[PDB]
Structures are given as C-alpha cells and as structure tokens.
Amino acid sequence: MNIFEMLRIDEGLRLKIYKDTEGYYTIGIGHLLTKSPSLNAAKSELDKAIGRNCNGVITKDEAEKLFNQDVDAAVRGILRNAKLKPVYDSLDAVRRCAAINMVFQMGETGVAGFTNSLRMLQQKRWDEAAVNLAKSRWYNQTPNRAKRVITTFRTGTWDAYKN
Numbered sequence: 001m002n003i004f005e006m007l008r009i010d011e012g013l014r015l016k017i018y019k020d021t022e023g024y025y026t027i028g029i030g031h032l033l034t035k036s037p038s039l040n041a042a043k044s045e046l047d048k049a050i051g052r053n054c055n056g057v058i059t060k061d062e063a064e065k066l067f068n069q070d071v072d073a074a075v076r077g078i079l080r081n082a083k084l085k086p087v088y089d090s091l092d093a094v095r096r097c098a099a100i101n102m103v104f105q106m107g108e109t110g111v112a113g114f115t116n117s118l119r120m121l122q123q124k125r126w127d128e129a130a131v132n133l134a135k136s137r138w139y140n141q142t143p144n145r146a147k148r149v150i151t152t153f154r155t156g157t158w159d160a161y162k163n
C-alpha cells in the first residue's frame with residue numbers, strides 16, 4: 001500500500017475522456033483536463049499533456065505516466081506551501097498519503113478551508129480531526145471516498161483500502 005495504489009483505487013482507470021464527479025473532462029487515473037464545457041478544449045489539453053494527437057484516447061502507459069506526474073505535483077505543492085508543509089511533515093507515512101490524496105482531488109485552493117482540520121491533525125487529535133474533516137462539501141459530495149481518506153487520517157492504517 002502506497003499513495004499510487006490508494007489513488008488508483010479512488011480514481012479508477014479510464015483510457016478515454018470521461019467526466020469526473022463534478023462534470024469536468026478528465027482522463028486516465030483522475031487527470032483533470034479542463035473545467036471548460038468544450039470537449040475540443042479538453043482534447044487540446046490532452047494532446048498537450050501527452051505530446052501527440054490523441055483524439056481523446058490514451059494508452060495505459062500514458063495514463064500511468066500522467067498519474068506519476070500528477071502525484072508528484074501534489075507532493076511538491078504541499079512542500080512549497082508554508083501552511084501545508086509543517087502539517088505534512090508532522091505526519092507519519094500513511095497519513096501523508098491521505099494528505100496527498102486530498103490535494104490530488106481538490107488542489108491547494110480546495111484544501112484552503114481545511115485550516116482547522118490541519119491544526120487538529122498537527123495536534124494528533126485524530127478523532128476530532130476526523131469529525132471536522134467530514135463537515136465539508138468534500139465529504140457530502142464524495143462520501144465514500146472521503147470516508148476512506150478520513151479513516152486513514154483517523155487510524156494511520158490502510159484498513160479502509162483493504163476492506
């Protein structure tokens with residue numbers, strides 16, 4: 001169990017352009033292409049990302065390559081963010097995966113409202129943090145995935161992804 005396996009479970013794998021839970025064009029292992037309603041705009045983003053004319057379809061190797069880039073971008077964004085890095089560095093490896101998972105899903109801007117959750121996590125008040133994390137649009141809109149991530153923060157185990 002590692003961040004790649006965790007996010008592969010949460011995001012799945014699709015080789016043709018699809019829409020994410022918010023209705024946005026996406027491909028691969030949860031790679032957001034664009035928030036624009038234009039499928040042509042999404043196809044342009046895809047071709048730019050892959051480096052060839054894809055017609056909205058990629059290979060598994062390409063999906064996995066984009067995925068590695070996307071995970072790394074989430075990590076480096078945490079490490080460059082003066083608010084997120086201290087909390088991240090206070091966590092054990094399993095809980096760090098839960099943090100990366102959230103940044104992958106929502107970005108640095110999407111986690112900006114989680115200030116109180118971050119404080120509870122840095123204080124290692126795991127049950128309180130879990131309660132606080134669930135008081136969110138994130139939890140209400142993707143509750144099964146949020147429950148898995150929250151259980152990971154609460155327990156520091158992979159139990160939610162083995163179950």
Ligand SMILES: Fc1cccc2ccccc12
Pocket residue numbers: 078084085087088091098099100102103111114117118121
């Ligand atoms: F503990 C954390 C560290 C860095 C980023 C995070 C994003 C969401 C939730 C928790 C985080």
